[PDB]
Design a protein around this ligand. Structure first.
Ligand SMILES: Cc1c(Oc2ccccc2OCCn2ccc(=O)[nH]c2=O)cc(Cl)c2ccc(C#N)cc12
Ligand SMILES: [Mg+2]
Lengths: 547, 401
């Protein structure tokens, strides 16, 4: 008998101040009892478990569904935290094309790795005997229990430790490690590849690890985590979108999820009109009708999901390119590719929740997102094609009060183009009329006034019902814009309005702000000045709107 | 050669912090570096029984193409117990010149307490989550940890004892992996003395604090004023009245009476000139009752002025500035705002280390996502400060210009 290489155990402790689980064993039917006796008998014969004396105080409930089921929930609540490296999963668009690829799923994953002996006593459980007229049969685990908290991390770490030297000795092949599965790839000939696979499973056999003996049970195309993996290409598993005349919140959540999942390879997927209905959630039962925008949106989603689309694999020798398009209503879509018309992958970006915003900022955010994603997937930043002129970006970042940056990029002309809709003057305008504006509202009656006086003698005061100070101060500026020429100076005392306009939104949730924007767009030159209120500054007339 | 026992603060578990994605070259750099460090016993691979993780990335210091490894020990530092205290050398900021040295390599000789090592765990990440990240823990004193210089204080004292006994006029301070050396010599004599000190440290960044000072509030001097000019002046004086007690603006505001054009020239009255003069005299004096509190956090605010110019203020209580300045230095950063801001934050932090011996909390004029995405690409410093993000444009911008 050739000795299998020893696998060193990982020391495990319970959370501090906690003791091993003591839980009452559930009453079982005689049938279930017999079944569990047989199963645990064969397991004891296989060395997976062992009979223990009465000494062990700890116990775990076992069930029968025959297949046994040890409910380690309490022990999991009492077991220490582990390092889980499973955050994130390999994205198909990140893989490099290989001439030959093999998938190996190790049988008896957790039952092949030994458990730290000093912890085994906490994995104790008992089988109820017939009629409970004899002491129940006591067992403890000797290997990693299925359903235990620490099994995946320990198994994976062990697997890595075993795999390291073979990988070191074989640079001409690449091995990816994922749970109970290994993925080997190479650009070698098919015979040499199969040979090296045999070598690998031999090397694994030395430590006592079993891989499929037959022609490996999985051959292309591979169905894995919602993905379809083909030799020259990748895509997603076919879409299922339920159609019902009555929709619930949970159904909307599922639909949104599936659409988002589909959007990584299918370009043009939109999910705004369906996500707007998820306000006032946490009630999973409800009936929410759809607007024409939402119905047309879902119809367009069915229009795109009509025919299959494939992404390609990654080639390090070619540049990485991301191209962005504006979709409207804070929606953005992007394609990542190397060769034209052959996308590595796709995606979308939705603007955050805010009162005001402009296109350039959203574009910047989209670039940041795509950048992070690309660093995750290919380990590099792609070159960008953006629907914005060099001059526009130049003006923006040079005059923006915040610091801002975009990596290497070039202008692609594919309308709608992102532009700066208006620009304020840095200095007062000569020959332009000077509008001193002001607004004020009564806190109680919600009645207010907004208006202006100018250097040429032009005046106006408008009375307003149901309004606030900020609203009147915005309204005043709006009035000034309405009744003035192509060039105008405007003096205000509102830090609020000045703050809003200095943020340079091209769009807002407040109709008044939007109308002010629309007024700014029609203007040639606008200088917006600010003064302190109630300082007795001439021309600034709080008394004209306080009446 | 003897490990000193180190614990954490009561009721605080070790740091668990997400490792952020790294580019391929940074990952390869870290693999090479950590392999070499592993061969030298400085670090060791660890198993899954270690839940704790601290972030790590790669940089390139000044005048060097060699990749350096940097560990973000912030969370561990704030979770590490307080180490007790050497009073800050208030004469260090009063010296003519100060040179900063990297004494980090000296920390790798001293072993780290065995029971504490599991808290200094970090992970070299993989591209596309293809393989599990390489996990390490430190065996010796890690650079970036606040406990390392505190432990090495005795050793450093014993090493720098002869040099101190040699030149009593040279102030020596220590912060993290950096050693600050203040003197009043000549730049040549300075550099030679620094070579002497570094070879003295071998066998075992010119910064001039006098050229930097605080800054006053200045008002324009004009022969002719416009309505716009006077409006801006009144605005700035009104702002400054939050800092200086005796500021009054009624006589100047009296000039703006009526609705005039912004470009119209207004002759000053004698009362207005008098008031303006009084305001000048007031502004020429320092600020009343401005003190430093070691128990309070230092706050730094930075404004982008444009054309590579940046202004900043260090304070604790609002309108009580401890320091003000203007970073306008241009090196290779012409086309990049984030690089400028990063270098500015670094310089301000350094100044703060020299003056008070602790780093300030920043308020950056940048979106969180942008900064978070790009700041590590331009960061040459060994330490890291705390920061937050101001999303609303301040009006005081041109009031600090
Ligand atoms: C099979 C395979 C991989 O394969 C690779 C393994 C190692 C290195 C490089 C690989 O792929 C490069 C790209 N590629 C892909 C499929 C193919 O048929 N040909 C090809 O060239 C890589 C991954 Cl993440 C897989 C994840 C899940 C499953 C399943 N079930 C199989 C996988
Ligand atoms: Mg007002």
């Amino acid at each position: 008998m050739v000795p299998i290489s020893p696998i060193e155990t990982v020391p495990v402790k319970l959370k501090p101040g906690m003791d091993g689980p003591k839980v009452k064993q559930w009453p079982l039917t005689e049938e279930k009892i017999k079944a569990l006796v047989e199963i645990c008998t064969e397991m004891e014969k296989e060395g997976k478990i062992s009979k223990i004396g009465p000494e062990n105080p700890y116990n775990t409930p076992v069930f029968a569904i025959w297949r046994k089921l040890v409910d380690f929930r309490e022990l999991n609540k009492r077991t220490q935290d582990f390092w889980e490296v499973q955050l994130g999963i390999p994205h198909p668009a990140g893989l490099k094309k290989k001439k030959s690829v093999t998938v190996l799923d190790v049988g008896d994953a957790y039952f092949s790795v030994p458990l730290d002996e000093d912890f085994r006593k906490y994995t104790a459980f008992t089988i109820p005997s017939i009629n409970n007229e004899t002491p129940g049969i006591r067992y403890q685990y000797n290997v990693l229990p299925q359903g235990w908290k620490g099994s995946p991390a320990i198994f994976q770490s062990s697997m890595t430790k075993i795999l390291e030297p073979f990988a070191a000795q074989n640079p001409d092949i690449v091995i990816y490690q994922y749970m109970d599965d290994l993925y080997v790839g190479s650009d070698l000939e098919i015979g040499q590849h199969r040979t090296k696979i045999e070598e690998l499973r031999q090397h694994l056999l030395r430590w006592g690890l079993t891989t499929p003996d037959k022609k490996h049970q999985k051959e292309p195309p591979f169905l894995w985590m919602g993905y379809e993996l083909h030799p020259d290409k990748w895509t997603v598993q076919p879409i299922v979108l339920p159609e019902k005349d009555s929709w619930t919140v949970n159904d909307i959540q599922k639909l949104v999820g599936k659409l988002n999942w589909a959007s990584q390879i299918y370009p043009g997927i939109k999910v705004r009109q369906l996500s707007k209905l998820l306000r006032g959630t946490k009630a999973l039962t409800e009936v929410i009708p759809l607007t024409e925008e939402a119905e047309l949106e879902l119809a367009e989603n069915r229009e795109i999901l009509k025919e299959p689309v494939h992404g390609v694999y990654y080639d390090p020798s070619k540049d990485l390119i991301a191209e962005i398009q504006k979709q409207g209503q804070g929606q953005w879509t992007y394609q990542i590719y190397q060769e034209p018309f052959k996308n590595l992958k796709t995606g979308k970006y939705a603007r955050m929740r805010g009162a005001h915003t402009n296109d350039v900022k959203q574009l910047t955010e989209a670039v940041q997102k795509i950048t992070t994603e690309s660093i995750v997937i290919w380990g590099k930043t792609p070159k960008f094609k953006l629907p914005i002129q060099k001059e526009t970006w130049e003006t923006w970042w040079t005059e923006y009060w915040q610091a801002t940056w975009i990596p290497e990029w070039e202008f692609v002309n594919t309308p709608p183009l992102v532009k700066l809709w208006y620009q304020l003057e840095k200095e007062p305008i000569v020959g332009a009329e000077t509008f001193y504006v002001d607004g004020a509202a009564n806190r109680e009656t919600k009645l207010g006034k907004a208006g202006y006086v100018t250097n040429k003698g032009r005046q106006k005061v408008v009375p307003l019902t149901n309004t606030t100070n900020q609203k009147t101060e915005l309204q005043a500026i709006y009035l000034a814009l309405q009744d003035s020429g192509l060039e105008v100076n405007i003096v205000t005392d509102s830090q609020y309005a000045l703050g809003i306009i200095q943020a340079q939104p091209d769009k807002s949730e407040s109709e008044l702000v939007n109308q002010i924007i629309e007024q700014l767009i029609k203007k040639e030159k606008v200088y917006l000045a600010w003064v302190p209120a109630h300082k007795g500054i001439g021309g600034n007339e709080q008394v004209d709107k306080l009446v | 050669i003897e490990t000193v026992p180190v614990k954490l603060k009561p009721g605080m578990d070790g740091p668990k912090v997400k490792q952020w994605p790294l580019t391929e070259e940074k990952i390869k750099a870290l693999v090479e570096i950590c392999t070499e460090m592993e061969k030298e016993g400085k670090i060791s691979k660890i198993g899954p029984e270690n839940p704790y993780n601290t972030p790590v990335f790669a940089i390139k210091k000044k005048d060097s193409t060699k990749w350096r490894k940097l560990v973000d020990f912030r969370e561990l530092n704030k979770r590490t117990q307080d180490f007790w205290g050497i009073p800050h050398p208030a004469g260090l900021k009063k010296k003519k010149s100060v040179t900063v040295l990297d004494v980090g390599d000296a920390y790798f000789s001293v072993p780290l307490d065995e029971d504490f090592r599991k808290y200094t765990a970090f992970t070299i990440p993989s591209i596309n989550n293809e393989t599990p990240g390489i996990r390490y823990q430190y065996n010796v004193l890690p650079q970036g940890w606040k406990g390392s210089p505190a432990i090495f204080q005795s050793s450093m004292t014993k090493i720098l004892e002869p040099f101190k006994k040699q030149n009593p006029d040279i102030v020596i301070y220590q912060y993290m992996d950096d050693l600050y050396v203040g003197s009043d010599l000549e730049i040549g004599q300075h550099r030679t003395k620094i070579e002497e000190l570094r070879q003295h440290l071998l066998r075992w960044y010119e910064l001039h604090p006098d050229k930097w000072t605080v800054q006053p509030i200045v008002l324009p001097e004009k022969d002719s004023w416009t309505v716009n000019d006077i409006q801006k002046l009144v605005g700035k004086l009104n702002w400054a009245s939050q800092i200086y007690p005796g500021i009054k603006v009624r006589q100047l505001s009296k000039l703006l009476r009526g609705t005039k054009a912004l470009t119209e020239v207004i002759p000053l009255t004698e009362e207005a000139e008098l008031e303006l003069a009084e305001n000048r005299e007031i502004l020429k004096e320092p600020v009343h009752g401005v003190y430093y509190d070691p128990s309070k956090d230092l706050i730094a605010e930075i404004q982008k002025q444009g054309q590579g110019q940046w202004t900043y203020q260090i304070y604790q209580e609002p309108f009580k500035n401890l320091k003000t300045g203007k970073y306008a230095r241009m090196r290779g950063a012409h086309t990049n705002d984030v690089k400028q801001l990063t270098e500015a934050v670094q310089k301000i932090t350094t100044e703060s280390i020299v003056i008070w011996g602790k780093t300030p909390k920043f308020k950056l004029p940048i979106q969180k996502e942008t900064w978070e995405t790009w700041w590590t690409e331009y960061w040459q410093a060994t330490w890291i400060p705390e920061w937050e993000f101001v999303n609303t444009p301040p009006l005081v911008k041109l009031w600090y210009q």
